[PDB]
């Protein structure tokens, strides 16, 4: 069962200062957001949908005893893909860097300001991997960004 | 949810002589394997993911008592699509040729060597359908990759 939650708002999504630690308002354009509605294997998209659902639930509904586990139990599968965290658990088991859901990295254009879709920062031995060990992935992301810019 | 397992390794996938019967090593290019990450209704992709998961589990995790039922039950949904085998079950019920995931066919370019994504061989009366009765299908396949040859 694929998720069906669509992100609110030109066409991008903005993470407010509350959803980020030690950071101010951040914003991502329409191109980056549009990938969240098509791909089933992005952790940032899942967490972004979770944050959007939390915000909408707070605004639209009331509050009472904060025992809202029923609401998330009803709509757990409409926001995230459980097989993604399952795959991360398998990668953790096999002694391989996995997707701790805390940190993310992305590529910023120096002048245009265009931003790629953030990818989660891999961790191993309980410590964050250092970019000398996944520079190839960053180069691949830059190549994909250039190719998208061409069209 | 949907499957999240990604196939290992330019960019293609090679089945060793142990994964096939009465055959040698067989490689498939990037242009065919890349379709396995978006199509939700490809039988060969699901079986190839199963084989890759088995190989990685043998290579990395230890083997003892061979009671790996917990491991496969834990990550069955991250490798295959249950609705595919359900659809095959319904097609078998309705007296229509179905697929038991044993035999596959593909198209070779005699000179170039590029191939298409294998499709599984249908079965009736507990016997394989013969090439005439799905020849049209094969034709379509060729046309498709001919279009892929255009770009």
């Amino acid at each position, epitope marked *: 069962g694929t998720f069906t939650w669509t992100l609110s708002d030109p066409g991008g999504y903005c993470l407010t200062r509350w959803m980020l630690i030690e950071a101010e308002l951040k914003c991502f354009g329409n191109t980056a957001v549009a990938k969240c509605n098509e791909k089933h*294997d992005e952790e940032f998209c899942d967490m972004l949908r979770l944050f959007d659902f939390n915000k909408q639930a707070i605004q639209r509904l009331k509050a009472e005893a904060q025992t809202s586990i029923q609401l998330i139990n009803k709509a757990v599968n409409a926001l995230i893909n459980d097989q993604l965290i399952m795959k991360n658990h398998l990668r953790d088991i096999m002694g*391989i*860097p996995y*997707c701790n859901y805390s940190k993310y990295w992305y590529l910023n254009h120096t002048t245009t300001g265009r931003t790629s879709l953030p*990818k*989660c920062w*891999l961790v*191993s031995n309980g410590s964050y*991997l*250092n*970019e*000398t*060990h*996944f*520079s*190839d*992935d960053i180069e691949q992301q830059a190549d994909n960004m250039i190719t998208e810019m061409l069209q | 949810g949907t499957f999240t397992w*990604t196939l*290992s*390794d330019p960019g293609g996938y090679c089945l060793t002589r142990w994964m096939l019967i009465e055959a040698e090593l067989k490689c498939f290019g990037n242009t065919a394997v890349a379709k396995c990450n978006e199509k939700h209704d490809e039988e060969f992709c699901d079986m190839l993911r199963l084989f890759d998961f088995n190989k*990685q589990a043998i*290579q*990395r995790l*230890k083997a003892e008592a061979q009671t790996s039922i917990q491991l496969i039950n834990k990550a069955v949904n991250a490798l295959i699509n249950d609705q595919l085998i359900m659809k095959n079950h319904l097609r078998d019920i309705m007296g229509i040729p179905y697929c038991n995931y044993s035999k596959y066919w593909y198209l070779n370019h005699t000179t170039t060597g590029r191939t298409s994504l294998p499709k599984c061989w249908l079965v009736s009366n507990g016997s394989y359908l013969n090439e005439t009765h799905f020849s049209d299908d094969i034709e379509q396949q060729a046309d498709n990759m001919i279009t892929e040859m255009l770009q």
Partner: antibody
Amino acid sequence: VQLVQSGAEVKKPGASVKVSCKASGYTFTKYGISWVRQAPGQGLEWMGWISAFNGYTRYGQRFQGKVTMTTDTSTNTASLEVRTLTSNDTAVYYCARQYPDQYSSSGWPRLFAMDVWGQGTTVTV
Amino acid sequence: TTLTQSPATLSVSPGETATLSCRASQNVINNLAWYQQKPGQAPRLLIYGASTRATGIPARFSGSGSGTEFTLTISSMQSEDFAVYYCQQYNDWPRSFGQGTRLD
């Protein structure tokens, strides 16, 4: 493509040794440098690995503090510094080129070995 | 992880094959390297990976094995093949070299 380790030199125990290996024929910032020590009559022994991209260092278990690695991308040079010398520290030091291990979310780890080696630099106390 | 070589020496006449063994402490999936070191020369990479030859290496050398157990086979051992052979694992840090066996 080869690496040159600037000949060799010897000194009395207690001093410091600075061994330099210069890389050429390839892009320096894409490959890190590993250091291997071979005692006279003994086998090879791993010391450490420094990435030329940003300077990230992995040190040996018994070489932290005693041995330091530095890099200089301006002149394509890797440097190895030893502060304390001992009768058993006499050896031959080899500078080798190694690609950093690569990891990705959609993929599997790709690990690398030492591709090319420079001529050894001998140190006797 | 510490890995050891079983023969530790090999007095073999030229002409016939030579077999070298390498045993690993833990599991090392196809992440092995075989180097050769001539007398008074820097080591050079012979085999990278379990069974893959480096560029410019003659087909006489061939690696095999996986997991814990690895082997190296030389078909036509010649005069230029008299060196010291080293087994290294690069599956995890720190990188570990073998004790090395001398082929004379």
